[PDB]
Ligand binder design. Structure first.
Ligand SMILES: O=C(O)C[C@H]1CCCN1
Length: 164
């Protein structure tokens, strides 16, 4: 069902997370972590303190889909086990901010064709699939986008609820 999911999404904030490759999203799914550049790190840290849930929605560039969405369980922290990210052409490992811990809520894909009716007021009402890495998605658009994903029966939101 969707009731616990809607409860997790109640009054949450949403952010569009864009990755250049599937490998980083796969590491994120396996290890429950995400790392980004400081300009986004700062935004995500602010949002984590401000809202009951901060939801990251992942899309791999050029894939035409979203790959799932997760909930921030921590602010960024430095000095863990180094994560073997596949870094973009210009970027090195010292250029990243800290590591966020995330709980996946859905590891299933959603094709852009299914979200074409969803516009993001915080990006000029362009379709929600359009946006830079870190773009915030307005509450109602983000909520309906998460509800479009196929249910992930591998995930039990009982555990995530207990962290809010
Ligand atoms: O957020 C960024 O722009 C950088 C990438 C590196 C690992 C995953 N995020």
């Amino acid at each position: 069902g969707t009731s616990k999911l809607k409860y997790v999404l109640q009054d949450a904030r949403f952010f569009l997370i864009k990755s250049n490759n599937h490998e980083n999203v796969s590491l994120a799914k396996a290890k429950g972590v995400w790392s980004t550049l400081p300009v986004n790190e700062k935004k995500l840290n602010l949002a984590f303190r401000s809202a009951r849930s901060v939801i990251l929605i992942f899309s791999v560039r050029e894939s035409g889909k979203f790959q799932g969405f997760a909930r921030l369980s921590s602010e960024s922290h430095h000095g863990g086990s180094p994560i073997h990210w596949v870094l973009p052409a210009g970027m090195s490992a010292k250029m990243l901010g800290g590591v966020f811990k995330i709980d996946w809520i859905c590891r299933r894909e959603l094709p852009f064709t299914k979200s074409a009716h969803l516009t993001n007021p915080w990006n000029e009402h362009k379709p929600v699939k359009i946006g830079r890495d870190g773009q915030e998605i307005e509450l109602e658009c983000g909520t309906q986008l998460c509800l479009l994903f196929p249910p992930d029966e591998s995930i039990d939101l009982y555990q995530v609820i207990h962290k809010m």
